[PDB]
Every structure is written in structure tokens, then in C-alpha cells.
RNA sequence: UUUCACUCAUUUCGUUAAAUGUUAA
RNA sequence: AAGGUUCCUAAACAACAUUACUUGGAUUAGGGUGAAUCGAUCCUAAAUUACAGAUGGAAAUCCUUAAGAAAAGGAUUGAAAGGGAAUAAGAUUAAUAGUUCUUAAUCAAGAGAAUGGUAACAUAUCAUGAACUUUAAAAUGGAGUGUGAAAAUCUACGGAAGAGUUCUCUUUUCUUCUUAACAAAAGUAAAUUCCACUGAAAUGAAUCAAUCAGAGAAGUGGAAUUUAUUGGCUUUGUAAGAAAUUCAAUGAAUUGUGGUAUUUUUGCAGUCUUCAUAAAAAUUAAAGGGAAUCUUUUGCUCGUACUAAUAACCGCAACAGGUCUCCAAGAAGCAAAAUCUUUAGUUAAAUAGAAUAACGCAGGUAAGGGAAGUCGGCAACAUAGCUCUGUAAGUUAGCAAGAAAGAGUAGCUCUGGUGAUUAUCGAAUCAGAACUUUAAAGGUUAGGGGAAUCCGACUGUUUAAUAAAAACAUAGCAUUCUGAUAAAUCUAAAAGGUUCAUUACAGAAUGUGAUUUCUGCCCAGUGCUCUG
RNA sequence: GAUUCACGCAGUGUUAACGUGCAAAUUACUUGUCAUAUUUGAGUAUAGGGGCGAAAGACUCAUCGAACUAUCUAGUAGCUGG
């Protein structure tokens, strides 16, 4: 069993000081600095995690392809497909009701 | 390092002017044509000697070609 | 002698409120024209737990009536409100639970909470969990109404003070018996440093006026005048009665 | 499993019989499920003191500290309803 | 354990060097110098500290520009 | 410490520089009484309080 | 001689000092 | 963190390290610390400090966005453990190395008005998108259970190379058989959430547990995300040319495939718990809206040596005291326990030799008796693991309880039970039977038991350095005042300050001390109060 | 805010060692405890008739029934020594 050491000058097991021990040539084990776990986007109404958008750090979406950070739909990337269907029905049905309620009832 | 998959991608790669150095490695089974470009080190694994020779014909004459074998340079 | 712990509390060094994870200030929106001559519609986005208080807080979202954008408020939840509900505030609001109305448009016998003692001051009375105030009478002569405070006291207010219809949520909070000293320790997570209270008689003569001698006792009456100086004001102040009631 | 100490058997024998009997009523009602006033499913569980969430129905309701609706908060909803009707008509 | 044992945890500085007097009297948490009275504009001098006055005052240093003026 | 400020390191370097002795030639001057530097210290003998 | 009525110093508050008051419409 | 040259080398030993020293953390003299990617620098947290204003005899205090012709909106500082653009492998030095060298990358700042799918959603930049507004990320407790994956250990098959044992055997025992950042996409997983078809009752589906369904289950076919970089695992480029193990005198050889085993790490899934609900900003992306019409250059400042402790730190010292973390093998066992070993480190860490007196300090044993010693079973002895049977009074009905008490346990040779795939393969676990012996937990580790009385209800805290308790706290009970311009209360004062981001289920001030039961009579005196 | 063992911690007993000590409070065995009223690092807040205290007049740099430091100060002594 090969025992390793911290490479950087951090000495405490904080969230940002996560390490992974991998093997290298000759039976030597080195230290890799592993990333933190992020959260994905959430629907602004129901707070459910959206599909089609990866769970990566906020600055990493700048490196993402322009089509890999949003879904091709009205309110894509901010609202679930169910969050949007009810939006359309609300917009249409209420406007229809306001046409028979007022405007020569 | 990137790996090209078929011949026509590396024929096109050589006839462009962006090549910087070519290293040929001969192994127990295959031959790798690691063309060094400005950004990446593209390589092609060929399994036929005749196809390997054709690649050496297409290599330009102003570019340096390094042959590597069971002994490191 | 020394300074008693009651004196040290007024300095506010380790007795400051532990208000770091608190949500904000729970109050009505500022009074304007649309709250005085019309109604505004608010949407209850969420109901949340505010540390250090027993009642939940509602994140209500009104549209900005004068500019383009939103206006995010933080109300005290009336018992019954749910997410996605619509609430209306203004002089013309309906008498439904959760709606904010001037105290003069509410009928006699109605129940309101988060009442304003002075118009536009965004809520003073009846804010704790389960508490409420009842409207007693109106006086159109000078536009004043009477309400009964949760302590049984009767108070007269201007008829245009706002109030939320209903009962503050979280009722019955104090009916569950605390059982462990640890549970009482956790009660003051978002409050002041006051919990483990040493009896004065167990102290020494320097520290407290009760600090006794060879037997733990007070030695002098524990009912004091209101005009006692700080430091010796310990026990019962201006007490008109004592003992057990029958 | 137990004769007459239902849920407060976790407290063992160290808080007084009466204090364990009193807390038993609250602790049963605090963890119990309630009928959701919108979707009518017994799927409402307490999140915090005074906050109740309908699990398979996507709603949050403000209620009592340990019960979804208190007695005091139940007669108020009817009392306001009666006054609202009287105010509208005459 | 008020004697030898409690001294082991002493590894946190209270004072560091001051910019105006050069002494290790700058209190890190009070943000003032115990010796020369930093950011306070006037130098910290007291009548009960007569030895402190004869340690740092006029004439205890180089007097780079006053030595010519008074000689003049 | 390993990490130090820029100015603090230079005041550490000067303390190293001043921990030297009298050069031999200076000791051969006529009427010389300076033989040893009495402002000398060692890391394990006296801490320099800085 | 307290007893009142107004505000004009004064007290206590609120906002982005964001429709107060009177007519008209 | 602290120390500050203690690091390395050479010369040299006067002093120092309770003998000595050729040794040294000691003397003398040189050498040594290399960053676009690690940190500080950047952001804000608890908190902190300025101009103008307010206060004060004064020094100075207050205020931190409220008072201001100040700052689209609120100033300064505050973290080398919180957030954050981007670097890895091999080699190299007497000493520096995610910093140098080789090779291979990454990031920032630049310079040169679209399709497809029913749908979930998908397309090497693509495929325009201003003001303004919103949403999300950064960014959020703990417990316990199940499980995916990697590494380590163990093990199965198949070999290659080297070493050990070998008069007694051993087809034997041991060592090596490796691979980075960043990217690719042959093959192929687990879990969750959605989409389409259809409509469940004779109710089904499913987990270790649960849990779910006509605001729609199961079935079939799909989409998406997570799984320590692209896309989790194998594989691939990197990349065998490196490195490891051998052989020869620079040059040659090999570098398969598995596991229904254990541990660690890392995620995931739902469950439980709270009168506790478990940070913010810098910064980024998307949406609503419709204003307008591959190559190359640069990447600045500062820290970087060494110890991190039975000798580099704090205790006067090379002081048995104290001081925050990361990586972590075999045996054995329930066990990260005691005990022994492997890789690594060290054999010196305030001097030895001889003799083997008394009195000592530390560890022991003992005939017969068995607390008769003593203030007192102080000290020591004694019980001790696991399995089966059995277990009282009392009781807040939960416990007492490992009550008390009794039996078994070793070695060797066997037998049966508990699964997976269609006979083979694997898991340590349980039960049983003969035979033998020194009759078996006890090398180490490892509860003495019972009957009562007093106090405190309990878990907890306490006189650092003679008192750990019956003392304090505690939940429970109760009393008092207060409508918030208040009550308590800090300040010399103050558009001053605390509880108060508060509002009677609250704030403030006290006594008693769980539960059960009960709190008797007295208002004359002293307090306090009154609507007199 | 169940019973225990372990890494740690404390300090019940020996009223053992030591007591011009390893140490101006330590050592050995024994005992208690060993995660939610827990343990702990750094930052930050509270200052002398003040603070802080689950309360011992405890703690506030080996200093506490009023810290340390300098000045008034060569304080005063019907008392003691020369």
C-alpha cells in the first residue's frame, strides 16, 4: 500500500480540497484535485430540475456549446415543459373569458 | 492529442501547409503517423505496410520526418 | 458589589440577537395610492421557516404598479394560506383570509392579525403564532375603531390602519412540553443568550441582591417599587398581588 | 410490542409518566398524515413548525404547529365567511 | 494547568510591527499602536511616562534636515 | 511561516545579515577594542521578537 | 382657572419624500 | 500557526548537548528558495473604519446610509480552512520544484436573421439579438439503510523473469508484471425523472424499509441527467519511445483474463429528525422583449529553502507537559481493541563497569486460617468472551436484567442447511456425528454478586493548582410587570445603544426543582399596591 | 439528550511515585467518559467598582474578595530592626 501526500499547501479536508488517488507508472500513486458537485437548473415555478442541461459550475457554461445550455422552446432553460403548458393555457383561456365577460356580455 | 480515423482525413492533413513535424513509430503490429501540428498531435494507426508506404510518398519535402523504432531517439 | 446580569444585558455584547439566518422584516408593503384607492394582487410564491420565530413567513410577489418589474414582500402567514394563492391588499379588498384591508372596512366581530397601531407603520400588533385581534366597534364620527389586543386590553386606532384577515399560523406551538434541557438549548438558536438561568439566591452577595448567607433565602421582600435603581430591581416590580390565585 | 406506552416508549423511563402521556398526543398528531384540502389525498406531512406540504400534489399550506388545522383556526374561517356574506347583502 | 501546560497553545500574534514607530506594538484587533499611537495624528506621549519620552523624541534620531537649519 | 509578506521577509533578511562577526582586518587597526559583536544571537538561543 | 378648539414650533414614524386636498371630467 | 537560515556542502572541535565525541539543530566560509495554471492579490461573513452630520468643557464619542446639492445606487477593511478562469506524467540538483528540462494540454485578454423529433428533446461556433425585467447556479444541517464505481487487501485461471529452502520433504515460498492531465466514442452498466400508445378492481406494482396509481399504475417503445476530465466502466489517442523486472557488454526480452469476498473513498436513492430548518457577494448562463442593420501576441507584483516536534514551536533547556490537520499493509478477532510482523524510520535519544549487603521504587507468588487488620475490604485477590436454559421483589408498566442461577466450549475425520447459470461456479456461516487427548474462552483482551437506608429525579456543569459532591443547571410548577413613543437597561451626552430582522403562544424580572400526592391557618408588623 | 468498547479526554482512588521533581501541578495503574447541553482550529466581540460565569468569589497571560503598568510617592507609621 502506497501512501501519498497533499501536493498543494492546503492541509485540511475542506470541500474545495477534495483529492482522488490514482495510479501511475511503476506502481506510484499520485494526487488529483477533483471538482465539486454542482446543481442543475430549476423551474422557476415548481422548482424541479430541468432536463437537457448539465450540472456543471456556472463558469463552465461559457465553455459549453451555445445549444448545450438551453432547450429549444419558449421559456427554455428557465421553465419545465409542464411549467410552460399551463402558462399557455392561462394566457389563452383567461383572455377568452375576458372577451365574453366584458365586451358586450 | 487527437486520433484521426480514416485515410482521407490524413491525406488532407498532409497537403495543408500547417504541418510542423512528422514522427513515424513502428510497433509489434501497427505503425503510427503522429503528425505534429500547431495545436494538437494527430496520429493515424495503420495496419498495412503498403498503406504506410503511400503515406511517406505524400509527405512534403521541406518538413522533417523522424523514424522511431524499438530504441528511443 | 458587581453588576447584575440584568445590567450586563443592556450593553449588548454577547446578548445581541442571533439574527444571521433570518429571512428579513415581516411587514406589509408601504402605503401608496393603489393600497388607498384600489387593490393590488399578490401571489404567494412560497411559505418558509424564519429562524427564531414560531410563525411561518410567506414570500408574496406583487407587480410594481408604477414601474416595470416586481415587488417582493415578506408577510406573516395567516393560517390557511397556500402556495400559488392570490391575495389582494387595498381599501377595496374582499373579506377573505389573507387579504389586507384597512381596519375600518372590516365588520364588527371580525378577526385580524398584524394590525398597524399607527397608519403606514407596516404591522405592530398580533404577530406571534396563533395570535389575533378582534374588531370591537367603529366610530365614524372621528374615524376610529376599537380592537381587542391578544392580552385582553382594548385599544383605539385610526380607521385607516391596515390589517390581515385571519389567524397567524403555528398555533399551539407552546402546548408541547419541552422535555430535555437539550431541547430548550436549541430553542434559542436564533434568539439571545439568556437560557441557563442561575437563581439569584444561589449567587454571592456581590453578584446579586439575593445572594444569601448560611441558608439559601432572600431575606427581604421580593416586591419592589417601579422607581428602584437598576441593579437592585430584582423580583416583582409594582406587584399588586402575589401568591397562588383561587 | 407495548401495553400502554405507544410512541413515547423511546423516552424510556426518565421524564415522568404524565409528561410522557401529554407529549404522546402531540407526537402522534405531529407525524401523522392529513387529508389535503385540494387533492383530497392523505399525503400532507409537516416540514417545519406551522408548514405542511402535500407530497404528491405540489402544495404548501400554513397550519398549526403540530396539526394541519387548529380548532381556533377552524371557527375563524367560518366566522369570516358569515361576515363576508352579511356585508355583501344589505 | 495554569502554569506550564497552558503555554503550549501560544502561537497567535497579538502585536506586529508598526509603520510609524517600527516597534512590535501594532494591535491587530484594536487596529492601533500601543506605543506611538498610530492612526491618531499626534504621537502618544504622557507625563507619567518620562522615560518613554527620553527614549523616542526629538534628538534621538538622525535629524536629517533640522541639523542644518539650527546650525544655519 | 512559509508564507510571509514582502517587507517582513526583508526585515528577516537583514537580521540574517547582522548576525555576523568582526572581520579580521578591522581587528588589526591601531587602538581597536571591538573584537566580538555583542549584538549576536542564535535561533535556538534568543528569539528576536519579530 | 382648567376647560377646550386649531397648528406653527415640537414628538414619533414611512417611502423610490410616487396621485395629499379642492374642483372638473 | 510559530521559528528564521536552524536547509546543503567543505574546513575545523576552544566553548555547548550532567562521561567523551572525529558527531551535531554547535564554530568558520560559501551555496541554495525559479509559477499565466499552486496560493496571496479578487469577493463578501461575524465584525471594522472614513468625508459631511449629530453630541461633548475636553480629549474624543455616536452614525455606516440614516440626517448630505456626498457615496445606476450605496463608502473602507475584514478568510494563505468559506466562494474562485485555466497543468499533468517522466527526468533532473550536494538542496528547488503541480515552479526547472522534455513531452503533451488548458484558460483569459486580444489581433487577423436555421433545421429535425408526435413528445420528452437533439444538432465540431453555427443558425443576429440593445435598453429593461425575471429565473437559476456559486449556495448550504445531521442520522441511519440499500446500492453503482474506483483504489487497496484477498483470491481463481494462465504464464514470463529473478531470488529463498533443499539431505528430510516441498510441480514449493517470495518479488515485478504500471500508466497522468486533456480528449475520442468500438462495446456496455446502475439509479432517478420525464414522453408516446393503452387504460388498472378479480386491484395491481414494488423495496432491506418503504412507497405509488383515473390531475393516471404495471406493459411496450423512447428522451434526459448523475456516476472523482470530455460521456460512469472496459477500450482508445497521449503511449511505450516513459517506467518497473531481468540479461549482456550502450544493446536486448515480456507487461492475459476474472471474483454472488473485505475495507476505504466517492456518488446516488428514497426514510427519519428538529418550538434547531442548517451564510452572502464577486461571477456566470438562460429566458421574456424587439433596439439596430484556424493562425498568432501577451499573461505583471509577492510567498516558495527547512522543522512541524521524546531536539527546530510555547513552557529559562536537546524539559516524560502542551499544540490544528492529510495519506494508512498482513495475522487475529465483533472490533481502527491488546499482541506480533511488512514498506519506511531508528538502535541514539540527562554516562558506564564491577559486586549482587540492609532500607527502598516497580512487577509477583505462598502452607493452614479467611477481614480476626483497619476509622473504613484502603490495597490486592476474585468474576470476565460466546451459545443454550432460566431469571425475583419492586415499578412512572418503559424497566429492574448481562438480575440471581445452571450447562456447553479443544484437536482430528466427516455429514447436512442456507445460492447463481443451464452439471459447473462461489459465500463464510449455522447445526449435527464418531475418534483422540494434558477435558479445552482465558497468551492478550475480558462485568464480582446480593439485601437495604440517605441525598439528588434523569443526560449534563463546577472551585486551572488540596473539595466533582447531597453543590450549579435542567425540564415541570408558579409569581410579577409591560400595548411597543412600552418593560428591562448601557451611556457624560447624543436624529445614541441592546433584547428588537421583535409584538403577549412576546419581552423583561424572580422562587421551587422530574412524575404521583398535598400545598394547612395568619394582612397585626415590614414590604408592595389601590379604582379611595 | 438509550447501554457499552476503541482513537482521544478527564482527573475517582492509591490519600502510590516525585516532592532542592520529567514538570512553579507531572507520571503509573485504577476509575469515569468517549457526538447533538459533543470535541475542536482560525477569525471576530466583551475591559478594571469593568467584563465573563450551568455560580466555585470562579476566570480575566504562572497576577484576582477587584489585573498589569507608570505617576502622585522617599504615601503614613504612637510599631519593629540598625
**Quick check: B10 and B35 in contact, CB under 8 A?**
yes
User: What gap in Å lies between CA C65 and CA C42, rounded to an integer?
Assistant: 12
* Residue carrying C-alpha cell 422584516: C25
Q: Write the secondary structure of chain A as one string of H (helix), E (strand) and C (coil).
A: CCCCCCCCCCCCCCHHHCEEEEECHHHCEEEEECCCCCCCCECCCCCCECCCCCCCCHHHHHCCCCCCCCCCCCCCCCCCHHHHHHHHHHHHHHHHHHHHHCCCC
User: What gap in Å lies between CA F50 and CA F11, rounded to an integer?
Assistant: 9
* Residue carrying C-alpha cell 568582526: F22
**Quick check: C241 and C232 in contact, CB under 8 A?**
no
- Which positions on strand H lie below 7 Å from a protein C-beta? 1-6, 25-29, 38-39, 45-49, 60, 80-85, 88-90, 98, 103-108, 114-117, 119-127, 132-140, 150-153, 176-184, 193-195, 211-213, 215, 223-231, 236-244, 250-253, 265-268, 272-279, 283-288, 294-296, 301-308, 312-316, 318, 321-329, 396-399, 457-459, 464-465, 471-485, 487-490, 497-516, 523, 526-530
Cell of B69: 523504432
- Which positions on strand I lie below 7 Å from a protein C-beta? 1-2, 11, 23-26, 36-38, 41-46, 50-57, 59-63, 65-66, 70-71
Cell of E60: 534621538
- Helix pair angle (B49-58, B7-15), 10° resolution: 20
**Quick check: B51 and B8 in contact, CB under 8 A?**
no
* Per-window interface: F 14-33 vs E, CB < 8 A: none
* D33 CB contact with strand H at below 7 Å: no
Residue F50: list chain E partners with CB under 8 A: 17, 24
- Measured in angstroms, what separates residue E30's CA from nucleotide H65's C1'? 25
User: What gap in Å lies between CA C167 and CA C133, rounded to an integer?
Assistant: 9
- Count CB-CB contacts under 10 A for residue C153: 8
User: What gap in Å lies between CA E34 and CA E16, rounded to an integer?
Assistant: 11
Q: How far are the Cα atoms of A1, A34, D47 from residue A13, in angstroms, in the given order?
A: 21, 12, 32
**Quick check: E26 and E16 in contact, CB under 8 A?**
yes
Region at A98 (left for phi over 0; alpha for psi -120 to 50; beta for the rest) = alpha
User: What gap in Å lies between CA C18 and CA C26, rounded to an integer?
Assistant: 17
- Count CB-CB contacts under 10 A for residue C55: 30
A51 closest CA partner among A85, A75, A79: A79
- Count CB-CB contacts under 10 A for residue E64: 7
Resolution (angstroms) stands at 3.0
The closest nt to A22, taking CA to C1', is: H151
Query: Is the Cβ pair C109, D79 closer than 8 Å?
Result: yes
Residues sharing a CB contact under 8 Å with residue E39, sequence separation 6 or more, in sequence order: E31, E32
- The experimental method is cryo-EM
**Quick check: C120 and C28 in contact, CB under 8 A?**
no
The closest nt to D13, taking CA to C1', is: H398
Q: By three-state DSSP, how is residue C145 classified?
A: strand
Angle at C106 between CA C100 and CA C109, to 5 degrees: 120
User: What gap in Å lies between CA A98 and CA F13, rounded to an integer?
Assistant: 84
Cell of E58: 526629538
**Beta-strand runs (E) in chain C:** 39-48, 57-63, 70-72, 75-76, 86-90, 100-102, 111-113, 133-139, 144-148, 154-158, 162-165, 223-224, 236-237
**Quick check: E50 and E37 in contact, CB under 8 A?**
no
C46 closest CA partner among A77, D42, D71, D48: D48
User: What gap in Å lies between CA C219 and CA C208, rounded to an integer?
Assistant: 13
Query: Is the Cβ pair F49, E17 closer than 8 Å?
Result: no
Q: Write the secondary structure of chain B as one string of H (helix), E (strand) and C (coil).
A: CCECCCHHHHHHHHHCCCCCEEEEEECCCCEEEEEECCCCEEECEECCHHHHHHHHHHCCCCCCEEEECCCCC
User: What gap in Å lies between CA B32 and CA B49, rounded to an integer?
Assistant: 11
Q: What are phi and psi of C137, to 5 degrees?
A: -160, 160
Q: How far are the Cα atoms of B7, B17, B25, B36, B55 from residue B13, in angstroms, in the given order?
A: 10, 9, 18, 11, 11
Residues of E 47-66 whose CB lies less than 7 Å from any atom of strand I: 48-50
Q: Does C50 touch chain D (CB under 8 A)?
A: no
Cell of E24: 512590535
User: Which residue in chain C has the smallest CA separation from D30?
Assistant: C176
Residue pairs between chains E and F whose CB atoms are closer than 8 Å:
5
User: What gap in Å lies between CA C161 and CA C64, rounded to an integer?
Assistant: 22
**Quick check: B2 and B40 in contact, CB under 8 A?**
yes
C79 closest CA partner among C150, C128, C22, C136: C128
What is chain B's Cα-based Rg?
11
Among C46, C107, C172, select the one facing D70 at the smallest CB separation.
C172
By CB atoms closer than 10 A (0-12, 13-18, 19+), residue C230 is exposed
Distance from CA of D79 to the nearest CA of C (A): 7
Nearest protein residue, CA measured to C1' of H46 = C20
Q: Write the secondary structure of D13-71 as one string of H (helix), E (strand) and C (coil).
A: CCCCHHHHHHHHHHHHHHHCCEECCCCCCEEEEEEECCEEEECCCCEEEECCCCCCCCC
Q: By three-state DSSP, how is residue C200 classified?
A: helix
Query: Is the Cβ pair E24, F11 closer than 8 Å?
Result: no
Query: Is the Cβ pair D11, C48 closer than 8 Å?
Result: no
By CB atoms closer than 10 A (0-12, 13-18, 19+), residue C73 is buried
Task: Give CB contacts under 8 A, 24+ apart, made by A5-12.
Answer: A5/A31, A6/A31, A7/A31, A7/A33, A8/A33, A9/F2
**Quick check: D42 and D35 in contact, CB under 8 A?**
yes
Amino acid at each position: 500500500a502506497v501512501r501519498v501526500t497533499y501536493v498543494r499547501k492546503h492541509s485540511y479536508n475542506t470541500k474545495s480540497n477534495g483529492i482522488r488517488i490514482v495510479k501511475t507508472a511503476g506502481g506510484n500513486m499520485t494526487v488529483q484535485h477533483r471538482q465539486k458537485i454542482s446543481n442543475g437548473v430549476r423551474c422557476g415555478d415548481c422548482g424541479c430540475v430541468l432536463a437537457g442541461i448539465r450540472h456543471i459550475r456556472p463558469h463552465q457554461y461559457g465553455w459549453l456549446g451555445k445549444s448545450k445550455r438551453t432547450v429549444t422552446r419558449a421559456y427554455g432553460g428557465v421553465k419545465c415543459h409542464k411549467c410552460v403548458q399551463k402558462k399557455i393555457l392561462r394566457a389563452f383561456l383567461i383572455n377568452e373569458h375576458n372577451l365574453i365577460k366584458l365586451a358586450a356580455a | 492529442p487527437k486520433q484521426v480515423q480514416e485515410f482521407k482525413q490524413i491525406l488532407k492533413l498532409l497537403k495543408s501547409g500547417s504541418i510542423r513535424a512528422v514522427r513515424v513509430k513502428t510497433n509489434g503490429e501497427n505503425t503510427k503517423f503522429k503528425v505534429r501540428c500547431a495545436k494538437y498531435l494527430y496520429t493515424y494507426i495503420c495496419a498495412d505496410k503498403a498503406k504506410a508506404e503511400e503515406l511517406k510518398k505524400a509527405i512534403p519535402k521541406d518538413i522533417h520526418v523522424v523514424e522511431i523504432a524499438k530504441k528511443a531517439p | 458589589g458587581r453588576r447584575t446580569l440584568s445590567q450586563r444585558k443592556g450593553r449588548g455584547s454577547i446578548f445581541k440577537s442571533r439574527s444571521h439566518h433570518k429571512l428579513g422584516v415581516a411587514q406589509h408593503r408601504a402605503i401608496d395610492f393603489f393600497e388607498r384607492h384600489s387593490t393590488v394582487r399578490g401571489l404567494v410564491k412560497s411559505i418558509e421557516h424564519d429562524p427564531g420565530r414560531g410563525a411561518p413567513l410567506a414570500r408574496v410577489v406583487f407587480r410594481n404598479p408604477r414601474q416595470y418589474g416586481l415587488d417582493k414582500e415578506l408577510f406573516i402567514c395567516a393560517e390557511g394560506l397556500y402556495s400559488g394563492q392570490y391575495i389582494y391588499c387595498g381599501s377595496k379588498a374582499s373579506l377573505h383570509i389573507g387579504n389586507v384591508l384597512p381596519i375600518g372596512q372590516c365588520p364588527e366581530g371580525t378577526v385580524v392579525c398584524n394590525v398597524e397601531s399607527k397608519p403606514g407603520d407596516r404591522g405592530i400588533i398580533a404577530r406571534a403564532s396563533g395570535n389575533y385581534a378582534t374588531v370591537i366597534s367603529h366610530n365614524a364620527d372621528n374615524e376610529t375603531t376599537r380592537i381587542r389586543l391578544p392580552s385582553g386590553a382594548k385599544k383605539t386606532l385610526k380607521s385607516n390602519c391596515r390589517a390581515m384577515v385571519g389567524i397567524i399560523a403555528g398555533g399551539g406551538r407552546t402546548e408541547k412540553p419541552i422535555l430535555k434541557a437539550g431541547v430548550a438549548y436549541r430553542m434559542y438558536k436564533a434568539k439571545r443568550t439568556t437560557w441557563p438561568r442561575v437563581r439569584g439566591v444561589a449567587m454571592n452577595p456581590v453578584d446579586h441582591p439575593h445572594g444569601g448567607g448560611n441558608h439559601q433565602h432572600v431575606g427581604h421582600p421580593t416586591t419592589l417599587k417601579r422607581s428602584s435603581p437598576p441593579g437592585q430591581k430584582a423580583g416583582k416590580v409594582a406587584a399588586r398581588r402575589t401568591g397562588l390565585i383561587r | 410490542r407495548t401495553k400502554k406506552v405507544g410512541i413515547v416508549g423511546k423516552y424510556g423511563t426518565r421524564y415522568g409518566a404524565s409528561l410522557r402521556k401529554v407529549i404522546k398526543k402531540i407526537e402522534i398528531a405531529q407525524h401523522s398524515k392529513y387529508v389535503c384540502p385540494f387533492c383530497c389525498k392523505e399525503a400532507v406531512r409537516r416540514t417545519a413548525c406551522g408548514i405542511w406540504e402535500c407530497k404528491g400534489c405540489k402544495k404548501q399550506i400554513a397550519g398549526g404547529a403540530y396539526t394541519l388545522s387548529t380548532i381556533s383556526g377552524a371557527t375563524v374561517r367560518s366566522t369570516v365567511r358569515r361576515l363576508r356574506d352579511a356585508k355583501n347583502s344589505q | 494547568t495554569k502554569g506550564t501546560s497552558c503555554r503550549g497553545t501560544r502561537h497567535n500574534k497579538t502585536h506586529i510591527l508598526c509603520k510609524r514607530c517600527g516597534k512590535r506594538s501594532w494591535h491587530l484587533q484594536k487596529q492601533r499602536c500601543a506605543s506611538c499611537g498610530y492612526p491618531d495624528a499626534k504621537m502618544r506621549q504622557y507625563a507619567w511616562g518620562y522615560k518613554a519620552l527620553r527614549r523616542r523624541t526629538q534628538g534621538t534620531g538622525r535629524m536629517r534636515h533640522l541639523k542644518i537649519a539650527l546650525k544655519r | 511561516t512559509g508564507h510571509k509578506g514582502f517587507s517582513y521577509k526583508l526585515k528577516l533578511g537583514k537580521k540574517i545579515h547582522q548576525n555576523r562577526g568582526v572581520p579580521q582586518w578591522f581587528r588589526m587597526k591601531t587602538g581597536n577594542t571591538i573584537n566580538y559583536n555583542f549584538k549576536r544571537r542564535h535561533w535556538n538561543r534568543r528569539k528576536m521578537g519579530m
